[PDB]
A paper describes a structure:
The Mycobacterium tuberculosis (Mtb) proteasome system selectively degrades damaged or misfolded proteins and is crucial for the pathogen’s survival within the host. Mtb 20S core particle features homoheptameric rings in a conserved α7-β7-β7-α7 configuration. These rings assemble to form three interconnected compartments: two antechambers formed by α7-β7 and a central degradation chamber. Stacked β-rings enclose the degradation chamber where active sites containing the catalytic triad of βT1, βD17, and βK33 proteolyze substrates.
We subsequently fit our molecular models to the first and last intermediate reconstructed maps and achieved excellent refinement statistics. Frames 1 and 20 represent the most distinct states in the continuum. The comparison between the initial and final frames clearly illustrates the transition from a disordered state to a well-ordered conformation that closely mirrors with the canonical resting state of the switch helices. Inspection of sequential frames highlights the progressive conformational changes of switch helix I and the decreasing flexibility of switch helix II that accompany the resting to auto-inhibited transition. Switch helix I significantly rearranges and moves towards switch helix II.
Residue numbers in the entry:
A (entry chain O), B (entry chain P), C (entry chain Q), D (entry chain b), E (entry chain R), F (entry chain a), ...: 1 to 222
The structure:
């Protein structure tokens, strides 16, 4: 399990792997771990799937409920506070073993500079949150390898396509260096899913672009 | 870690994977686990590498020492007894965690029927040994998947090439179903190693044949 | 504690940090961890210093004793076997907490190709050894960060100076990403020590070259 | 984590480091640990960030709520009592491992002598509080080194700039003597944050002054 | 218990406190912890007295025995090795609770520069040794406070008297900041003992000089 | 921590030390441990400060509340019962480690003989109370030494000044024999605080008298 | 169990109680705990009687054996070393519960000043020894009370009778303050035993003198 | 702690010691343990004082409350039932260590024979009660010795004075045979307290009679 | 199990009960526990019978062996030392549960006064021994009751018959007060065994005298 997210001028990208493992045996091959909560942010949870899907659904439901009740969407700080409270409320279950660490990436429509409106937030096991400002952040088992790869590869990010390519390459490096992370599948045609958030909203990247990027990266590495 | 061995008319084949993992992180990519002790048998040990290489070297040294002292090679039963004693003498270290389960495949030159002279022997953690007679046997973490694949694929074994193809396909299935087993590497050009033992002795299969077999299997599975 | 070693055409380089920490408090600022055993190989041990210096001295003494007794130096395989036996004999003390993982880099004078005569060997806690062939290897607390940095930076290695620069940059990255690794000191003038082994023997890199390389890297990163 | 605070004629200064470490790996590089609750006092919490930010926000909210309800600000003794109750109410979580030790520095507008109106209060893990009167106090992992440095350097404090320089030098010494404390960053341009409280209220020290002070201290130490 | 030692041009000084405490109750008031082994070095052990006196006597006896047997005194490296072996041989008793950490200070008569012939060696609990080169080192319960005081006060060391004054001031600071360290006694006339080693040998500082230095320091601090 | 109290004809005196220690390190140098609850009695608590200040404040608040509600002050037996109930209600926290043993000294205005109206009450950890009648009582870590000193020195008590001198001498002896008790400070000018209760009420002894008494005692002991 | 010993001009006295208690029940009423080893020293052991008598007999036997073998008595330092070795050799039994702490008092015939030839040595549980120089020392359960009493009463010691009276008074105070120490028995006529060592040798004090001293002390205390 | 009670024609006597011990150290010298609940019975509790005084006060309060509510005193069986319920309700605290075993002695005014109206009741730790009919009963640490002494001495009981003398002698024997029981004090003038209950009610024995009885017993034993 | 022994002018008597109990069930009714080792002393062991008989036989064998080897009987001190060594050598088995506490009574033929030549020695579980001088001593489960009875009844001992009667009465009292001690049996005719030692040697008391004494005591108690 590895989820990466980096900031590019005018938006933010988010991607994750598609592998679920029960110990050392592979259980899933195309598991989806990146979800869209509402128009201008997406979340990704690494850990137990049973807690991850529940957290995603509950976060989306709470955001929609508040928006319907008050008539206006929550501010970014309010969303961060709600997610932090949700994470903190599961500390006992995390101690038992039901651990889920989410990653939040969104676009701030109430920012003076649209080019620097992208935000990346990481959460701790105890509920603490920190706003990422180095331009990238990764979570999961292979987070360290992906973070090092992004540290070296962030100099080539200029637009959305460059950021997507860097994210795919970081995921490939994490899968190469970690046995719990699943790389691109050229036999079954399974590729990581990505979400791009910009001023127009959050959209889902088509599988064709990710397939071409993965094929190009594999050819280059050969 | 997965090592497979099956019997074909006129000989016996033996193959294993090339992956070493320290927990969940990949440490090796072309680790060799199949060794040739003397002319008419080869061994393969799955488990801790530090114990596996030591066991292989010690077994070869003991066989050579006996052959030099007495002037004649040991019988197959004597070799099985020596290997069983060696395995039994390491039970305390196996209990602590230094476990090594070897697999023995050899050719009996003192058999009435040369076509049925192949032998496969499996060893337990307590030193018990059993002569395999179903025609195939696998050891390691992904032994069950490989054994099922060989159970379905043993009907197509007629000669050495068919047995080698079946072994490679079983290793591929085990790597597909197990995250601790490494499949063929089309980027770095790493392929499993195989040893063929027949009436002329034990030889090492060239990497080119294994590469072509793996490529054909991958193309067929696509 | 971080020690790195990579292979370049015609030799091999080896370097390590200069930090000793007692828990979370800094105890040493210029600790030397890379030692020269004899003419054509050098070793580096990461872990408890009391065991590291003892292991280095004992290995050098054993090599010199064998060379004096037999009149010829040991082969590389013999040196690897001796070091593996020494590491394996300390497993109980390592279990208690006195752990020391050495890294071996040397030059093989009995190789057909002088340009590919460099060797890098890594040792496990149980005494297992593996010959490194990816071109680089790192040990210590910050080994992962240095290994990722070398994975990205190995494409620029052409000669000794390039390899030394890559090693220094990898050490700098490891110190940046790890609080237990000490980076270059521009106030006290403390810089990591490096050893270069080639066909002419093993020599110690002067501090001036490492100082200039570290200053250039710091200026580039600014 | 290290937070220092000392008293100068006519006010009080407060500063802290910008390092967050998850065990031995660095997680944050510009973490803010000094916060302003209201006009005439500021607080600093060392320990778990998830508890520290919550404590700061809750203390500020409680003070504002009381001021709005009663129409007058709380006395200094009342603020100390409220903070002590808040600290005491978290003793079980501190026993489990969620420990947070705050440091309180403020200006008493109801004092006969304005020059001696500065107050420094330290809190224990059990909720006990003591008013600091030696002129300085430090909390965190590297509190001892900073306290010794301030013990030697307090003789040069005459005004606000002298106190700020002494605080920065004490933080530098603590970072030098402790691996968990982050010193000034000349590459990324990260410097410790400081807050100055005087008769006109609590203000935030601009980063430029701290940068010049740190550069001067580094040059002097060279 | 606190023992300090610092280097001055042309020699080395060594001093320690005179307090023995059984838990929280004071048992001794003039305990001697600095001993002279032979002509050109002195040792000081902090910890259990029953082990400290035994270690001092055994070290002196071993040095004298070697000098009598071989006719020449041991080199400094040999003395360090012997002391390290002695410390390492007591690791089990230290684990039970009989811990003794010695501090070694000596003068090297076989050095090119007489002004830089002073040496300070510190030993770890596991037997590891490191040659001190910052110019000072302290051991005992209040070692940190004394080390910080010496860090600030080392700039005034020019000769033997300055070094002695700095050592006495550091001991006074350690006694002030630590309840297990005994300061100067103006009622019973008990003062710390000091040993000065120079090119002429190791001598014992008379109590009168230490008394005057302590009185001057107390008057200055008033 | 040591608090002493003895009876003299016409009143009662009470005094305590000014040292707070966190294990073996000194944390406070002028901590106040003797408090005045109301007109005709004072209390002193030895142990955890966080519990001691809370107990003193709560006892004073309860006494004032009862006096305001009923219009008449509580009898001495009622005050003893209230304090015993308060002590008994904290037995679980004392078992965990939050132990606080108070000492009560007061003047009974409803006694037939004004000269024998002084009362001293000691409390146990389980809430039991006993009225002291030997003429003196001490509590704290160094209670035994102070009690022995008062046993020898009680023959010289004739009036208030004699009792104060005896109490100061007992505190000095306790500080001499105990490392957790702080004696008079001739450098920082810190002296123990004392409270005198007589027929006119409870008053605080000025620091000048205690300073002169301590100086005279120190001169006599020299 | 309480044994006291103090120094007077021209000799040294030693005395102990006569009570043995099995838990809380009295088992003995006239147990002797002070023994004479040879001419110029006597010893007293507090703790388990079965170990105490054995230690006394063994010490006397060893001293006599050495004197007979070498023809000259051991020096005082040699006797101290032998007793320390004997105490150290029983550390395991002391840990189990068979603890015996001896007290050594003797006269040095090889001293320049006969008036200051008295010596008092105390031993720790780990075998450490310290020469007493305050003029008095007590061991046993009620050692603290006796030591405080001697601290106050040492000013009246001028000769042997004064020292004996002070020792008897200290024993009486220890018995008064400790329930495990037996005071003088006026019904059965049991009184503590004392030994006086001077330039003429060690002699046993007659019971009549101790009886008169105890009666006078009891009458004075009435 | 020892409390004795025996029956004589026409009444019943009750007495107890005056010693309180905290482990092995004496804490009290004239502690009162025999109390009068109402006109025709008295109680004595041995064990923790904090529980003993509380039990005595609560029993007296309950008896007075019932007498005031119903207008008639409780029967003896009702009093026994109430005391048994009170003892049974404290079983958990007794299990923790807060054990208190009371002894009840009273006079039955509703009995046919006034000469045999005395009653002695003993209570167990579980709340069980038994009416004593052998003529005597003792409780406390030294209960066995006192019971044996009363077994031998009960033949001389004819009236109140004889019973009082027998009780005092039994207490003296218990104090002689037990170190936790305090005998008569001829120095401080402390003697055991006794209560005599007859047809006229319960009265307190004056100290003079007990003093004369103790002096006569001591003289006889001499 | 109860064994008693008391001293009378001109000799010493020794007696014990005849009951063996396995927990709470009676196993033996006439078990003999008093044995004669040699002419002038007898021993009695209380505890495990399997150890008691072995100890008696071994002690007798050792005494006879020494007497035969040297030609003269051992002194009383030598016998005490041998018995103490034998008891001390069984401390581990006693800790497991095989406890045996012997009682020694003998006649000293080498004493100046024949009337005071009787000796009684008691031994502890750790091997310590004490010579009894109060005139009586008892061991076993009911030792306390017998000792109290002898304390009251020792005033009537004038000769052998009086001592025997006192011993029988003490045994009867111990059996009455203890359920593990067997009293005289008037149905089966079982009575305690006694041994009388005087100047003429040790003899066994006939059962008729003990029967008459027990019958007289029973009649008197009726």
């Amino acid at each position: 399990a590895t989820i990466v997210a980096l900031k590019y001028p005018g938006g933010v990208v988010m991607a994750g792997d598609r592998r679920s493992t029960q110990g050392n045996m592979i259980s899933g091959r195309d598991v989806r771990k990146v979800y869209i909560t509402d128009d201008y942010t997406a979340t990704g949870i690494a850990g137990t799937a049973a807690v991850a899907v529940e957290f995603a659904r509950l976060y989306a439901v709470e955001l929609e409920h508040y928006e319907k009740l008050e008539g206006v969407p929550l501010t970014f700080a309010g969303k961060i506070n709600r997610l932090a409270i949700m994470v903190r409320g599961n500390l006992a279950a995390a101690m038992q073993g039901l651990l889920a660490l989410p990653l939040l990436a969104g676009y701030d429509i109430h920012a003076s500079d649209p080019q620097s409106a992208g935000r990346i937030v990481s959460f701790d096991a105890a509920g603490g949150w920190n706003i990422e400002e180095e331009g990238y952040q990764a979570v999961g088992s292979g987070s360290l390898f992906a973070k090092s790869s992004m540290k070296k590869l962030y100099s080539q990010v200029t637009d959305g396509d460059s950021g997507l390519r860097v994210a795919v390459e970081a995921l490939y490096d994490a899968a190469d260096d970690d046995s719990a992370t699943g790389g691109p599948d050229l036999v079954r045609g399974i590729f990581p899913t990505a979400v791009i958030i910009d001023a127009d909203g959050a959209v889902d990247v088509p599988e064709s672009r990710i397939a071409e990027l993965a094929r190009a990266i594999i050819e280059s590495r050969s």
